[PDB]
Write a protein that binds this ligand. Sequence first.
Ligand SMILES: *[C@@H]1O[C@H](CO)[C@@H](O[C@@H]2O[C@H](CO)[C@@H](O)[C@H](O)[C@H]2NC(C)=O)[C@H](O)[C@H]1NC(C)=O
Ligand SMILES: *[C@@H]1O[C@H](CO)[C@@H](O)[C@H](O)[C@H]1NC(C)=O
Lengths: 56, 35, 117, 257
Amino acid sequence: LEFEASQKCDLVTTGELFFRSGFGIGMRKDSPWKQNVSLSILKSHENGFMEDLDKT
Amino acid sequence: ADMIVAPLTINNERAQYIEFSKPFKYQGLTILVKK
Amino acid sequence: VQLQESGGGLVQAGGSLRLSCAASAAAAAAAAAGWYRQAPGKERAAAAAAAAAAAAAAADSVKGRFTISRDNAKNTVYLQMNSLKPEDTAVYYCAAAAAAAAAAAYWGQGTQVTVSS
Amino acid sequence: PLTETCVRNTVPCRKFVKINNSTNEGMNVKKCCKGFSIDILKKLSRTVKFTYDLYLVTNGKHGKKVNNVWNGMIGEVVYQRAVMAVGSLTINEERSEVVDFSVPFVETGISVMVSRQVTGLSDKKFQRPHDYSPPFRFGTVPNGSTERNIRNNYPYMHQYMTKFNQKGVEDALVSLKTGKLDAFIYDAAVLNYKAGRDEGCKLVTIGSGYIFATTGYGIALQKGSPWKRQIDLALLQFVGDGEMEELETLWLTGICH
Ligand SMILES: *[C@@H]1O[C@H](CO)[C@@H](O[C@@H]2O[C@H](CO)[C@@H](O)[C@H](O)[C@H]2NC(C)=O)[C@H](O)[C@H]1NC(C)=O
Ligand SMILES: *[C@@H]1O[C@H](CO)[C@@H](O)[C@H](O)[C@H]1NC(C)=O
C-alpha cells in the first residue's frame, strides 16, 4: 500500500501500523535446503545488496 | 513444488506445517483512504 | 568441596590414557564437570564437558581424540583419551560449578600428561 | 528490606560478586531483578510448564570470537552453562554459525545520535575527516556487535574509532551533551528509549527514525535440542494474541512522542 500510494498519487494511508510480522521464504518440513538458505540470507542482508535493491 | 518465493506472511496457521525461516523484510498493516 | 585428579604419566604418541577426577558430596547428581588444559605460554583452554541433563560437548580443536563419561552411582568422572599427539602435552584439570556454593572456580593440584617420541 | 524479598510479579535471581578486595569468600547475594525480557518468559512459561532459575553474567558484556575461543553468554551456551539464554542478544551471521536462534519478536538495527548535520553511512562527512572543520568524534562502544559488523565492510573508519572509545552508556550521553563527542553510534532499540525518557527532548535520531541493517532480537537455544519447535510456536502465538503491544507500551514510553 505504501509503494502504491507513492506511485499512484491522490491516495493516502491513514493511521500507524497496528501489527507486526515478517515476510519470508517457505519450504516443506525436513527439507535440507532450509539451514543453508537461512544462513546465506543473513550474510546477504549484512552485506547490503538487499538494502541496495530497495532504492532501486 | 518445494519452495515459495512470494510476499508470504508468517502466522500460527502456517507454522505448524511449513517452516518459514529468517524474515528478510518487516512490514505491518495499514488502511487506505482517498485524499 | 575438594576434588582430586590423577591418571597421568608418559605414553608414546598414538597411545591412550585414563585420567580421573573425584570429589566427595551427597548431591553428586547435579554438577557440571569440565576439563581444562593449560600449556606453557598459552592461556587455559576448555577440552571436554558434561551437562546435568546428560549431553556431551567436544571441542572442535582436538575433536575425536578423547571421550568423557560420568558415573551417577560413584562420585568420580574419568576421561578416556586415545590417539595421543604431541600437541596434547599439558596439565589437565577438573572443575565443577553451580548447585549452591560461591567463589565458583575449583582447581585441583594438577596431573601432567607427556606425549613424545 | 521490609521482608527480605520484593513485591510480587518479579523473579528472584542470584547475582555473583567478585568478593571484597578479593581477600576471601564472595557472597552469592539474592537480589530480585525485573524488566522487559524477563517478563515475557514469565508469561511464556505458564503454557509450556517450565521451572527456572536465573544467574547473571560473570565476565565481558556480550562476547567476541577471539583466538578461536568464546566468552560471554554465547560462550556460556556453547559450553552448556545454560540450556536457554535470553536478554539483549543480537542475531548476526557469526552468532548463528555456532548456536541456533528463534524467530525474532522486536525489530531493530543500528542508528546514530547527535545533539540538537549529515545524511548517513554514505554521507561524505563520514568518509574522511580531512574537511575544513576540526575533526569530530564517535561513540561506538567497543567489544560489541556493531563493531564486528562495522569492520566487515570498510576498515578506515574503525581505525579512526580506535583513537577514541567511549565507556558504558550513561557516561557516553553526558559526554555528548557536554561536547566531548559529536556522533554516537549504537543499536536503535535503546537509543529511541533514551531519547524518549529524557529532559527537554534535546537529543534525537537522524531522519524520521532512519535505520541501517535491520535486525531482530530473539532467544537463543542449544543446538539440536527438542525445545526448538515448542519454543518457536509458543512465542509466535503471543504475537497474534496482541500481547507484544501491551507489554511494549509499559516499558517503552514516549515523552517526546
Ligand atoms: C550447507 O552448505 C555448506 C557449504 O559449505 C555445505 O558444506 C559442504 O557440503 C558438501 C556436501 O554437502 C561438502 O562436499 C563440502 O566439503 C562442504 N563444505 C565444507 C567447507 O565443509 C553443507 O553440506 C550444506 N548442508 C546442507 C544441509 O545443505
Ligand atoms: C574491551 O576490549 C579491550 C581490548 O583491550 C579489553 O582490554 C577490555 O577489557 C574489554 N572490555 C570488556 C570486554 O568489557
